[PDB]
Structures are given as structure tokens and as C-alpha cells.
Amino acid sequence: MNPPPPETSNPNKPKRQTNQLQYLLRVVLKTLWKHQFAWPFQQPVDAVKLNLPDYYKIIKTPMDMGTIKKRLENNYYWNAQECIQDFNTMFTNCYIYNKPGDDIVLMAEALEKLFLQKINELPT
Ligand SMILES: COc1cc(-c2ccc3c(c2)nc(CCc2ccccc2)n3CCN2CCOCC2)cccc1=O
């Protein structure tokens, strides 16, 4: 019942290393990945194992940090904005599916505050 995970390899498009992409992997992803609340966000939502009714009927653009980490490690992103959009999608999905006060929402909000603190120091 789960869909295949988001693509993470980039076989047909060009690749580049930029200072912003370096910061996104070394600082932003690394800081959130090591956070105590990271585990639920480290791989695609398994709606079957988690018993999440209608998850993939409600969430049509799933995203997670395991995918973002692999995308950065595989040079899937050409522009830093593509990666920032993926983090935003991951948080937004959680807020859409869940309710205020749910444990997962409080965890996502703490991770998003940390994301915003780090994104404030994104370079040029
Ligand atoms: C990201 O969005 C959501 C996430 C989750 C979610 C909550 C807890 C989660 C998780 C996802 N993924 C994991 C870790 C991976 C996992 C998944 C399946 C069973 C076991 C581990 N865990 C920890 C499980 N815990 C610890 C080990 O004892 C079992 C209980 C729930 C709801 C809505 C969402 O929108």
C-alpha cells in the first residue's frame, strides 16, 4: 500500500557543488538529522506499519529527511531552493495530516524552528 520512495539519484541531469548546497548538507541536514526528534522524519512515512489511514490519499507530495540526505549526497539538486522546498514540503505534510498538539506536530515544529535558525545563516 505505500508508494515507491521519492527519487534520489540523478542519472540524466548535470551536477554541481555550491557553497549553499554544502551548507545545506553539512549544517542544515546534519543538525536536524542528529536531533532527538529526527527518527520519524528519517525515511518515507510507512503508512501501513504506522496504521495511518488515508495518508497517501491526503499527502500526494511525500518528503522526508532520508530522501533529502540522499538527494544532497547524490547531487540531485542543482539549486539550493529545490532542497529548501523539500524541507518545507516535509513539515507542511506533517501539519496537513496531523492535528495541533499531536506529538508528531510538536516534534515537527521544533525541527522546523531549528531549520529556520540554520537557514538564516545560509551563505552566498
Ligand atoms: C513524519 O510524519 C508522520 C510520522 C509518524 C511517525 C511516528 C513515529 C515514528 C515514525 C513516523 N517513524 C518511526 C521510526 C520508523 C518506524 C516506523 C514504523 C514502526 C517502527 C519504526 N517512528 C517511531 C516508532 N516508535 C518508536 C519505536 O517503537 C514504535 C513507535 C506518525 C504520524 C504521522 C506523520 O505525519
Task: Report which of 121, 27, 101 is spatially closest to residue 69, judged by C-alpha positions.
Answer: 27
Choosing from 1, 33, 39, 93 the residue with most ligand 1 atoms within 8 A of its CB, the one to mutate for a pocket test is 39
Domain range list for the chain: 18-122
Check if 48 has its Cβ closer than 6 Å to any atom of ligand 1.
no
Residue 26, CA distances (Å) to 4, 21, 33, 102 in order: 27, 9, 10, 30
Residue 70, CA distances (Å) to 9, 26, 113 in order: 8, 13, 22
CA separation for the pair 113, 55 (Å, rounded): 24
Structural method:
X-ray
- Nearest-CA residue for ligand 1 atom 9 is 40
CA separation for the pair 124, 96 (Å, rounded): 33
What's the topology of domain 18-122? Histone Acetyltransferase; Chain A (1.20.920)
